[PDB]
Write a protein that binds this ligand. Structure first.
Ligand SMILES: [Ca+2]
Lengths: 215, 56
């Protein structure tokens, strides 16, 4: 397994599941009509499921809403994964409550060493959680020679053992109440010297705000 | 048949969970595997029919 623990039910209210017949990616609710996820999670038709804990059972607090507009970063590179970020506008606003809430965009870039919370159904039935720190760029660079750009950040452990895995992409990395990362890629999962790589959200706050205001 | 049909399925570095088809030589047929969402190799098909047509 990926080393996480089952999150306390609805303790990560901003977490969403992207579904096109089955769960294939995660995402984060940033306001009542928009979700942020990874660009490699793009699909022409996407249904967003909010308020989920067990994605295989109808629990009663879920909200199912179709994506109305899917906007990938204009500079996304499918090969290098640079700028792996995408915005999804929902068909209608969701009802915000205790199980369905938004997460704040970063005020600034969090420094290495900051402890964060990574969540996803990745490894799917129950939402998994993982407490892990942002790693220094130098360490990230050493683990993935020539593959890390300034729009990426490594989060995890160089000894491996704990990590996000397939099914987690697009999901949140929240540190001190702010969305600092988006699950993107890695070589394997929980492998030593190959911690997960995440889209560094603080580099896109203006793009996000500008895009939402215009759409 | 083409060499890429005999290669093991390639999940890739991305962490999405997308079900794709790949031709399994040992089994002599196309089965499903989890693709990560990026950098697909050739033994990766959106459908069994395309998988069997190409690697049958
Ligand atoms: Ca459910």
């Amino acid at each position: 397994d990926k080393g996480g623990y089952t999150c306390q039910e609805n303790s990560v209210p901003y977490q969403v599941s992207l579904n096109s017949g089955y769960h294939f990616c995660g995402g984060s609710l940033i306001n009542d009509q928009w979700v942020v996820s990874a660009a490699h999670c793009y699909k022409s038709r996407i249904q967003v499921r909010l308020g989920e804990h067990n994605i295989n059972v109808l629990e009663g607090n879920e909200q199912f809403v179709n994506a109305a507009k899917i906007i990938k970063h204009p500079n996304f590179d499918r090969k290098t994964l640079n700028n792996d970020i995408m915005l999804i506008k929902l068909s209608s606003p969701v009802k915000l409550n205790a199980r369905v809430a938004t997460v704040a965009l970063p005020s600034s870039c969090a420094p290495a060493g900051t402890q964060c919370l990574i969540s996803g159904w990745g490894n799917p039935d129950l939402l998994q959680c993982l407490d892990a720190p942002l790693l220094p760029q130098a360490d990230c660079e050493a683990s993935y020679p020539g593959k890390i750009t300034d729009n990426m950040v490594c989060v995890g452990f160089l000894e491996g053992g704990k990590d996000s895995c397939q099914g987690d992409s697009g999901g949140p990395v929240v540190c001190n109440g702010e969305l600092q990362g988006i699950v993107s890629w890695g070589y394997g999962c929980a492998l030593p010297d190959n911690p997960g790589v995440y889209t560094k959200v603080c580099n896109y706050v203006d793009w996000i705000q500008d895009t939402i205001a215009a759409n | 048949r083409p060499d890429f049909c005999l290669e093991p399925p390639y999940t890739g570095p991305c962490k999405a969970r997308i079900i794709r088809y790949f031709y399994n030589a040992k089994a002599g047929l196309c089965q499903t595997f989890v693709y990560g969402g990026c950098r697909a190799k050739r033994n990766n098909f959106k459908s069994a029919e395309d998988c069997m047509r190409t690697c049958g």
